[PDB]
Amino acid sequence: GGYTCGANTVPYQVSLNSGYHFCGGSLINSQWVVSAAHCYESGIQVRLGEDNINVVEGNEQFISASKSIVHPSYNSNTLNNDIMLIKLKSAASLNSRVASISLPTSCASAGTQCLISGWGHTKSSGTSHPDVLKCLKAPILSDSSCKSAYPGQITSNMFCAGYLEGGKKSCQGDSGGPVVCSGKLQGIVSWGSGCAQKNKPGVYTKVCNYVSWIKQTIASN
Ligand SMILES: [Ca+2]
Ligand SMILES: [Zn+2]
């Protein structure tokens, strides 16, 4: 059923704030964040080093976004290619509590354990959530199990993680938040019934498919 992460124990976890916390993201180098395309908005401030999003606790860095880049093939209806890059106006100061997470070299496999983290804010859902960072350890599901859970909706750019039994709900991730497996950012919180229904997995953007695009885009902007 997940747990309270602990302050600054997930040092790559970002809050995106446009007046309020509206999405999560992952710091992938000192000047770039990975989030979901469905998180796209104007006037983004990136907030690093957060634990309680409503209290200044001493390790925060607030940096305005320079621009956001939604994936060229993002479809807002199907959520295929649900990935967006956010450039920071200035480089974050990296330390133990604020640190980047590595992009994957290879995709992850079913059965691999991942860490999903966030404040539980899903964009435009209206759902209640806590103010401190929450965590869930969950396994990647097989392609076949994922497709069986969501018939007609899982593309090659998506994967499922979570639990099909237990009677729990998984509401930890924010829209756009990290799914980190063996020290690599493998997923982005995208969609699913995992919070609304018990025994359903989350659906995540498959980051390994996008590494070339991410690297090329950063290198040119
Ligand atoms: Ca804070
Ligand atoms: Zn919220």
Side-chain angles (χ1 to χ4, degrees):
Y3 59 107
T4 297
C5 302
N8 310 117
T9 62
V10 188
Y12 51 83
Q13 172 79 58
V14 176
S15 163
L16 303 181
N17 187 294
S18 59
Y20 66 97
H21 167 75
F22 71 87
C23 269
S26 300
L27 189 67
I28 59 165
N29 66 31
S30 68
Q31 212 164 352
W32 288 87
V33 166
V34 163
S35 185
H38 80 260
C39 288
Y40 173 76
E41 256 177 66
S42 61
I44 299 178
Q45 187 184 58
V46 172
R47 300 188 161 204
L48 307 177
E50 289 279 9
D51 190 53
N52 189 313
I53 51 169
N54 277 321
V55 182
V56 174
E57 296 175 297
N59 297 294
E60 296 89 355
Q61 295 177 49
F62 296 169
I63 304 169
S64 298
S66 165
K67 76 183 183 186
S68 298
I69 302 172
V70 167
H71 194 275
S73 302
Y74 173 56
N75 182 302
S76 59
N77 293 321
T78 62
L79 296 181
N80 199 27
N81 309 293
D82 191 10
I83 184 170
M84 175 177 74
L85 286 162
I86 302 169
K87 183 180 184 181
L88 305 192
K89 178 175 203 180
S90 56
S93 183
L94 304 184
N95 48 71
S96 59
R97 295 177 177 83
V98 174
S100 53
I101 186 68
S102 179
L103 292 175
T105 300
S106 304
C107 300
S109 302
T112 290
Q113 181 184 92
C114 303
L115 184 69
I116 301 160
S117 54
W119 290 274
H121 184 99
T122 44
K123 181 150 171 175
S124 304
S125 74
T127 63
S128 180
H129 59 80
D131 288 345
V132 296
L133 194 68
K134 298 296 186 168
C135 277
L136 177 64
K137 292 180 176 187
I140 296 175
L141 299 185
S142 67
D143 306 347
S144 60
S145 288
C146 187
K147 290 168 145 163
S148 293
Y150 299 104
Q153 297 193 292
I154 302 300
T155 73
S156 57
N157 300 309
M158 298 172 191
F159 69 94
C160 292
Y163 298 94
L164 301 175
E165 72 289 311
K168 293 301 195 233
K169 291 166 173 186
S170 164
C171 302
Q172 295 86 0
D174 305 283
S175 279
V179 182
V180 169
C181 319
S182 307
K184 309 293 186 181
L185 182 68
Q186 297 283 9
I188 301 162
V189 176
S190 183
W191 61 279
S193 301
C195 179
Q197 298 177 232
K198 60 176 191 301
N199 306 322
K200 284 296 220 176
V203 187
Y204 304 102
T205 307
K206 190 169 176 170
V207 174
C208 64
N209 292 359
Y210 298 96
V211 169
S212 180
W213 171 77
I214 294 170
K215 293 184 169 187
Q216 186 170 318
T217 299
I218 289 171
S220 303
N221 284 279

